[PDB]
Amino acid sequence: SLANTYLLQDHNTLTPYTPFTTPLNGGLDVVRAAHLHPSYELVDWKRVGDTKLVALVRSALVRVKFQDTNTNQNALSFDTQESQKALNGQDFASYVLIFKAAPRATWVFERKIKLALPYVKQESQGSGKGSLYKTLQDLLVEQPVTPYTPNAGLARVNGVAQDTVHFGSGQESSWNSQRSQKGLKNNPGPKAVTGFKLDKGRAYRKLNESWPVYEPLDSTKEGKGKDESSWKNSEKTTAENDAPLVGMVGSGAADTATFSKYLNTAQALHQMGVIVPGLEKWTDALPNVITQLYHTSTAQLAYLNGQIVVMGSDRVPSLWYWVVGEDQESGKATWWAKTELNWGTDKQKQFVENQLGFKDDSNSDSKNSNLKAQGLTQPAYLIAGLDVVADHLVFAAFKAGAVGYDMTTDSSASTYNQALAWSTTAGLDSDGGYKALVENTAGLNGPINGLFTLLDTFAYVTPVSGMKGGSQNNEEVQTTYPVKSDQKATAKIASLINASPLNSYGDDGVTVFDALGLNFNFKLNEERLPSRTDQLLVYGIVNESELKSARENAQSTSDDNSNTKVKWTNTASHYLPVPYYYSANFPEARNGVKISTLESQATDGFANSLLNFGTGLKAGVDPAPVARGHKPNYSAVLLVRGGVVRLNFNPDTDKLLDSTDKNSEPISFSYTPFGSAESAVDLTTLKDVTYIAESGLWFYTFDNGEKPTYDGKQQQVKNRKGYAVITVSRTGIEFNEDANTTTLSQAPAALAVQNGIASSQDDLTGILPLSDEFSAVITKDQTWTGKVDIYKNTNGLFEKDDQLSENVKRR
């Protein structure tokens, strides 16, 4: 219509635009309308129906604190003292703002909702069963992955082999003769890696420790890992001297600088939503991990009939999400370590949980604080998005790597100073079909994969798995957690989390093969063998009752219900590796390849070709003709590294669209690799996602300005000016297209294309989809803001309309 207005953001302002391409007023400054502090930033907003507008705001002054040596007191709190200290040179919590429509365009503020810290029960032998508190006390979170992190930066030294673990050094000879009784019966991999060393490399910090701005170029050579003591005492200076910020003897405004040991990524971190004091627009250390965790956690929202869901960023792992009511004043976050998801099958759930840490009935140690031991599920996610459709919430995220680590004081120990993680790729001998493949026992309870020299060829997966061991081939192929039998009651395994969807950073081929999807069986109609811990995509459909249950849980003050979990049944997991061709080694349009030797040819806005990232989840109802009295079809689409994924749902059941067949690949998931041109689009710069109800199309708008100011080698970023638009469109046979279209053999897919709306010249304001044929690109750069350029769609391909753009341009 003409009456319809398109809203567009610019920092904290939301300006209404008409189809004449002109704005109705100077917009709504969400912060100043809410009577909020000037250090506030608007992070997400949604125009609920015709008269409501919900928004999300956060502050870089927020300061969080965790206590580790009274009654119903929470161990997690806001530190208003530090929040005040930052101001020079209340709690500044995040808020959900509700607005009501008024005369002309304009909005009127209606209320504010505080997103309070999640609850955790504090213990004290000087004041007054699974403990999330113990976990947190020894929880080591990785320093965030930047777009400037090279492949060798991820490359951590491999851990010890499992034959050394169970037999000791010098007694490995007796593997085959004693595997049967040591719980490794028919296990063919004695040389299987237990994990990776935490002695050096990229930073791993405790909940009250801080991540540094500097990062290793190669974690086999430099970095200090979890060793905060050594960094602070000697390596801090080395790092500072190697990678100082722009202005060496000229920073004061409030063997010298080689960049061969570290990369200074202060600029990249800032944009990721990480608080970097000094780089504030609205040397000194960064705020503690728990603070950045709260700040980066309040990034995305949705609205479902008086209920606001708030999830975290797609760039930093999130441990908690809010389910606040429109009526409430505040509201605590719900722990992900307490939100149990259906991973498709019990075995798929097991794979993940089993790697969370060490649990045995002989062990009752407090120092053994890992999530598995505290009976807690998967803690962290890299949330791609959430969207509301047909009175249901849909979401997608990449499961972040959450492993166990050895806390032992004993420096002569096998698993001393290392993280415990192993490959979970299905055996070469796996039975055929999807169900058969995901439920394969290879690496379920412990390591099994490594280099196997099958004839005149190599294989990084086990050639014997499941119920195929022994001479007769009917025996069990066994697997066990890397902790020696006699060392079980004494074991001190804490919990560790990576800022990526991988479990092991072990500098080997097996990891590279798991992350790139290169493990395949030797069948005629060759099937790819999947991982059940590395590069996993979690997605699903939740209802109001599941969300209420997630809210009630968060408001609980631990008590007797302290070990009660949230069960989201209509979710699923899917192995989503990065394209192998993104690396220069294996493009398909020496002594083996390890993480550190893996050269990248990725153009998608990352210095690596090892880690997967997911962004812009958007639902959308198919405008196609409806079947014989059936509900209209709807799907969700998202952009991952290398292609578009489409999540399909049964409208009738309001559940994930299933086929009732175990062998066939799931019809609720589809992945289509996109072309060379769309692989050239920087995915970290996604400004907006938009679905056109009438054309059944998704429009992903990317803005170059969202790129950092300087790279790791402290040089100004190129192509900062410009924008690019991608169109996603439905493809294939649709659920109930005709009468006999009962159950579909294939899954309905999507197609990502750079439709032609692109520039590398001006600063984008936004794109107003005028009609199915014409769209205007509104650009600033010039004095006043508003250049306007009309683009016409020709068979799905945009071309600038010289005539029309020249027309609208005269004031």
Ligand X SMILES: CC(=O)N[C@H]1[C@H]([C@H](O)[C@H](O)CO)O[C@@](OC[C@H]2O[C@@H](O[C@H]3[C@H](O)[C@@H](O)[C@H](O)O[C@@H]3CO)[C@H](O)[C@@H](O)[C@H]2O)(C(=O)O)C[C@@H]1O
Stretch 404-443: interaction string toward ligand X, x if CB under 6 A: ----------------------------------------
Stretch 615-634: interaction string toward ligand X, x if CB under 6 A: --------------------
Stretch that binds ligand X, among 38-46, 54-62, 216-224, 444-452 (CB under 6 A): 444-452
* Residue whose CB is less far from ligand X, 174 or 283: 174
Conformational region of residue 21, where left means phi above 0, alpha means psi within -120 to 50, and beta covers everything else: left
* Residue whose CB is less far from ligand X, 456 or 588: 456
Instruction: Tell which positions 330-359 bind ligand X, by CB under 6 A.
Output: none
Q: What's the min distance (Å) between Cβ of 64 and ligand X?
A: 43
Q: What is the dihedral of CA 133, 136, 138, 144, to 10 degrees?
A: 180
Which tokens sit at 182? 């040591």
Q: Is 279 in the site for ligand X (CB under 6 A)?
A: no
* Residue whose CB is less far from ligand X, 451 or 753: 451
* Residue whose CB is less far from ligand X, 27 or 427: 427
Of all residues in the chain, what percent are helix, strand and coil, respectively (each to 5)?
15, 30, 55
> What phi and psi values does residue 505 have, to the nearest 5 degrees?
-95, 15
* Residue whose CB is less far from ligand X, 108 or 454: 454
* Residue whose CB is less far from ligand X, 189 or 712: 189
| Residues with Cβ within 8 Å of residue 667, at least 6 apart in sequence | 648, 657, 658, 659, 744, 746, 747, 748
The C-alpha atoms of residue 216 and residue 264 are separated, in whole angstroms, by 9
Q: What's the min distance (Å) between Cβ of 705 and ligand X?
A: 48
* Residue whose CB is less far from ligand X, 57 or 477: 477
Among 81, 88, 181, 453, binds ligand X (CB under 6 A): 453
Structure letter (DSSP) for residue 177:
H
Instruction: Tell which positions 555-574 bind ligand X, by CB under 6 A.
Output: none
Q: What's the min distance (Å) between Cβ of 455 and ligand X?
A: 10
Q: What's the min distance (Å) between Cβ of 184 and ligand X?
A: 11
Q: What's the min distance (Å) between Cβ of 767 and ligand X?
A: 53
Q: What is the dihedral of CA 667, 673, 678, 684, to 10 degrees?
A: 70
The C-alpha atoms of residue 31 and residue 37 are separated, in whole angstroms, by 7
Among 436, 451, 467, 692, binds ligand X (CB under 6 A): 451
The C-alpha atoms of residue 402 and residue 419 are separated, in whole angstroms, by 10
* Residue whose CB is less far from ligand X, 462 or 553: 462
Which tokens sit at 70? 């009274």
Stretch that binds ligand X, among 257-265, 328-336, 447-455, 570-578 (CB under 6 A): 447-455
* Residue whose CB is less far from ligand X, 20 or 458: 458
* Residue whose CB is less far from ligand X, 190 or 446: 190
Stretch 207-246: interaction string toward ligand X, x if CB under 6 A: ----------------------------------------
* Residue whose CB is less far from ligand X, 189 or 643: 189
Q: What's the min distance (Å) between Cβ of 430 and ligand X?
A: 17
Instruction: Tell which positions 139-178 bind ligand X, by CB under 6 A.
Output: 173
Among 16, 23, 150, 190, binds ligand X (CB under 6 A): 190
Residues 713 and 263: beta-carbon distance below 8 Å: yes
| Residues with Cβ within 8 Å of residue 182, at least 6 apart in sequence | 166, 167, 480, 485
CB contact burial 715-748 (16+ within 10 A = b; e otherwise): eeeeeebbbbbbbbbbeeebbbeeeeeeebeebb
* Residue whose CB is less far from ligand X, 452 or 671: 452
Which tokens sit at 216? 């290793």
CB contact burial 287-297 (16+ within 10 A = b; e otherwise): bbbbbbbbbbb
Among 259, 452, 671, 710, binds ligand X (CB under 6 A): 452
Q: What's the min distance (Å) between Cβ of 590 and ligand X?
A: 17
Stretch that binds ligand X, among 189-197, 255-263, 379-387, 786-794 (CB under 6 A): 189-197
| Residues with Cβ within 8 Å of residue 798, at least 6 apart in sequence | 725, 755, 756, 757, 775, 791, 792
Stretch that binds ligand X, among 87-95, 188-196, 424-432, 749-757 (CB under 6 A): 188-196
Q: What's the min distance (Å) between Cβ of 486 and ligand X?
A: 23
The radius of gyration computed from the CA coordinates of the chain, to the nearest angstrom, equals 26
Q: Is 450 in the site for ligand X (CB under 6 A)?
A: yes
* Residue whose CB is less far from ligand X, 187 or 684: 187
Among 37, 111, 185, 191, binds ligand X (CB under 6 A): 191
* Residue whose CB is less far from ligand X, 450 or 614: 450
* Residue whose CB is less far from ligand X, 451 or 621: 451
Residues 714 and 263: beta-carbon distance below 8 Å: no
Count of residues interacting with ligand X (CB under 6 A): 10
Q: Is 118 in the site for ligand X (CB under 6 A)?
A: no
Which has the closest alpha carbon to 501: 490, 511, 493?
Answer: 511
Q: What's the min distance (Å) between Cβ of 190 and ligand X?
A: 5
Which tokens sit at 35? 């009577």
Q: Is 185 in the site for ligand X (CB under 6 A)?
A: no
Q: Is 189 in the site for ligand X (CB under 6 A)?
A: yes
Stretch that binds ligand X, among 184-192, 690-698, 709-717, 727-735 (CB under 6 A): 184-192
Stretch that binds ligand X, among 420-428, 451-459, 630-638, 745-753 (CB under 6 A): 451-459
Residues 147 and 139: beta-carbon distance below 8 Å: no
Which tokens sit at 480? 């066990």
How many CB atoms sit inside 10 A of residue 705's CB?
14
The residue with its CB nearest to ligand X is 450
Helix/strand/coil for 325: strand
Q: What's the min distance (Å) between Cβ of 528 and ligand X?
A: 20
> What phi and psi values does residue 262 have, to the nearest 5 degrees?
-135, 170
DSSP for 412-458, written as a single string: TSTTTTEEE----PPPTTPPSSHHHHHT--TTSSS---S-B--TTS-
E strand or H helix that includes residue 759: strand 749-759
Residue keyed to tokens 């190697």: 242
Stretch that binds ligand X, among 255-263, 308-316, 348-356, 445-453 (CB under 6 A): 445-453
Inter-CA distances, 271 with 227, 595, 711, Å: 27, 27, 12
- Residues present in the chain in total: 811
Which residues contribute to the site for ligand X (CB under 6 A)?
Answer: 173, 188-192, 450-453
